[PDB]
């Protein structure tokens with residue numbers, strides 16, 4: 151009579167990392183890619199012979215900086231003249247060109263100079279997330295919910311849908327990232343009455359705070375605040391500067407001019423930073439870092455906390471601003487939700503908990519997975535086609 155329907159997927163199309171989930175058997179499965187990773191870098195690389203997407207693109211970035219594209223989400227739906235675009239271009243090793251006041255990324259690919267619109271690069275990331283899902287389900291996937299930041303305008307939302315259409319996905323809906331994180335915790339299933347929810351989203355490069363009101367499952371965005379110059383990469387930079395100084399003291403050598411040594415140092419720092427979220431100390435062990443000198447050292451969580459102390463405290467300024475904009479007091483917030491890998495930092499959790507007078511933080515769903523989790527819950531709801539009984 152009626153063939154079984156394929157599952158719909160939920161995609162968190164992130165600035166630095168993307169995540170895909172599917173709701174089946176009353177639960178969400180976050181789908182790992184073929185290298186066993188539950189999140190996939192939003193990177194696309196171009197060579198004379200291949201186009202690489204995800205981990206394969208990010209793993210070859212050091213020697214191919216001009217032809218490895220990342221951060222397309224910062225360009226999507228924006229004009230070339232937009233002041234945000236002009237400032238961001240100074241930090242990118244790839245070329246951004248002007249095509250009718252619309253930015254395009256220009257690379258060497260298969261023997262030619264090729265330019266792509268940001269939605270075309272995002273469609274390549276979406277094609278990889280669709281293939282990750284089809285490898286797990288064992289059949290072709292058509293339907294998806296894709297998330298966007300709450301501050302995205304109409305042009306940014308339409309370009310995200312366009313990226314989905316290019317990838318061969320039927321876009322069921324574009325939903326806000328803070329709404330998806332709230333849905334992940336079932337905060338829209340608590341029945342009658344108003345609930346105020348604060349979403350605290352600390353990413354690789356930016357920080358976003360959102361205040362939502364939920365009434366009978368209806369979401370209203372009350373306030374958004376944040377810091378475009380605060381993320382995980384700033385904490386990595388503080389460790390980098392600390393270890394460059396430490397090498398100077400110990401071996402009387404300045405390593406800061408050998409890109410390879412700095413890159414090996416930063417890669418090691420990011421991993422030490424992750425270890426410090428679970429351990430009270432972490433070792434750093436690099437062989438022949440500079441002039442054949444082995445760099446074997448350690449860092450305590452207390453020293454790391456001191457190195458980033460001002461940056462961690464500054465996350466509370468957009469929280470107070472969002473609360474003023476929403477015209478609410480901190481005691482009036484019913485639920486606190488953590489989003490982003492950087493929220494695993496114990497000190498970040500402690501500062502926010504202390505600000506909300508000891509309140510529990512919702513962090514049981516991996517913070518780097520909560521947005522895709524909620525998007526997958528919504529995708530399964532949107533494809534239901536139940537006919538009422540008499």
Ligand SMILES: Nc1ncnc2c1nc(Br)n2[C@@H]1O[C@H](CO)[C@@H](O)[C@H]1O
Nearest residue numbers: 166353354382383424427491492494
């Ligand atoms: N356990 C963790 N503790 C501290 N930081 C983390 C952790 N896991 C992730 Br993921 N991150 C950071 O989150 C950002 C995501 O773009 C990057 O800066 C990652 O370094």
Ligand SMILES: [Mg+2]
Nearest residue numbers: 164327353521
């Ligand atoms: Mg995100």
